[PDB]
C-alpha cells in the first residue's frame, strides 16, 4: 500500500472515531457520486434544442432548468443544501452562430458535478488552468476545435460559486432527431466546451489514459 492509502485510512478512521461523520455518511456520499454522470446535462441541451421556451429558461435560470432533467441542485445531493463544493448556482452558457463558450476553473477544478459528473484529469491540470484563459484558440485547436475568427470565443472562469455547462449549437444533419438521439451526441467534452456535437460521435475523443495503481 502507498503512503496515500495509509493516510486516507488514518484520516477516515479518526474522523469517524471522533464523530465528525459516520461510516454510513461516507458510504452515502460515495453512492451519490456513483449516481453522477454527464447524461442529465446532455438531456438538458437536447430538450433546449427542441423547446425554445425551455432554452430561454436554461439561459436565464439554470438552477430551475436543471429540475427538468431530475437534478435539483439543492435537494438532490445528500446534504439537501447542495453539495458543499459545487453549490447551487448553475448557469447554462448558450453558444450561437456568433458565440462559442469553453469552461475552466483557473484557481482549481470547479465543475458542475451534480449535473455532469466528476471532472477530467486534464481539466484539473495546472497546464489547462494556465493556458485556456489566455490562448483559448490555440488550446482548442490542440483539442481539434476551430471556429471562425469573427466568432466570439468566450472563456468562462468558474472562480466563485457559479458552475457552468455549455449548450452547443445544434449541428447540421439532425433534422427530425428525437431527444434521445440528440442527447447522445452531446458528450462531456461538448458540455465543457472543448468539442462540439457531431452526428455519429457519441463518446469523447480518445485520449491517452493514465492507469491508477489501485483503481476500483
Amino acid at each position: 500500500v502507498s503512503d496515500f492509502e495509509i493516510l486516507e485510512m488514518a484520516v477516515r478512521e479518526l474522523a469517524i472515531e471522533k464523530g465528525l461523520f459516520s461510516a454510513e455518511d461516507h458510504r452515502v456520499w460515495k453512492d451519490y457520486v456513483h449516481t453522477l454522470g454527464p447524461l442529465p446535462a446532455a438531456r438538458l441541451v437536447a430538450k433546449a434544442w427542441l423547446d425554445p421556451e425551455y432554452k430561454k429558461l436554461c439561459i436565464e435560470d439554470g438552477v430551475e432548468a436543471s429540475k427538468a432533467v431530475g437534478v435539483n441542485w439543492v435537494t438532490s445531493p445528500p446534504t439537501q443544501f447542495g453539495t458543499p463544493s459545487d453549490y447551487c448556482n448553475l448557469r447554462v452558457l448558450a453558444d450561437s452562430p456568433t458565440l462559442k463558450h469553453v469552461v475552466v476553473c483557473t484557481l482549481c477544478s470547479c465543475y458542475p458535478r451534480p449535473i455532469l459528473g466528476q471532472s477530467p484529469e486534464w481539466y484539473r491540470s495546472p497546464n489547462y488552468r494556465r493556458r485556456l484563459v489566455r490562448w483559448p484558440r490555440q488550446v482548442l485547436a490542440e483539442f481539434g476545435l476551430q471556429l471562425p475568427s469573427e466568432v466570439q470565443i468566450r472563456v468562462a472562469d468558474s472562480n466563485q460559486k457559479t458552475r457552468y455547462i455549455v449548450m452547443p449549437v445544434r449541428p447540421e444533419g439532425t433534422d427530425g432527431w428525437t431527444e434521445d438521439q440528440l442527447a447522445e451526441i452531446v458528450t462531456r467534452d461538448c458540455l465543457i466546451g472543448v468539442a462540439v456535437p457531431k452526428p455519429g460521435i457519441t463518446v469523447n475523443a480518445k485520449r491517452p489514459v493514465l492507469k491508477a495503481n489501485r483503481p476500483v
Partner: protein, 152 residues
Amino acid sequence: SSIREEVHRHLGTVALMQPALHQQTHAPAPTEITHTLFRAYTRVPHDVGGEADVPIEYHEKEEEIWELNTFATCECLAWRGVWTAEERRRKQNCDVGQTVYLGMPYYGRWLLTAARILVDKQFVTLTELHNKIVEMRERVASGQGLGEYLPP
C-alpha cells in the same frame, strides 16, 4: 516504432538540460527582496491563470480507490460542519505553499488537507494522528489488511 519512441524520449529528455541561471535562495536579507519578489513570494499559489506553459498531450486518468475515498471524506467533513468548501480551498490550494502545490498530486493535497483540518480545529491531536499512522502501518505489516486496499 522503437525509433519514434526513442525520438520522443529524446525530445523530453533534453528539456532537463535547458540552460538557466539558477540562483539558489537561502534566507536572503530583507534588502534582497524587491516589491516584485515580495508579491511573487506572498502570492496565493492557486492563482495560475495567464502563466506561460507548454502544450501537453492531455490525458484522462483512472481513479484510485483512495482518491474516491478522499473526495467523499472531504465532502462529508463539510456536509457535517467541520468546514465549508471555501475553508477547504484556502487550506488545500493555498496554505500548502508553492512547492507542495505543484510537487504533489491533486488528491494528495486534498488528503493532506483533510488530515490538516482535523488537527487545526483540534478534533484530533497531532499525537493521535501520528499514532494512527503508526497503527495503519502495523496493521499492514502484521497481515491484518488495510480496508479495501489490502485484504488480510
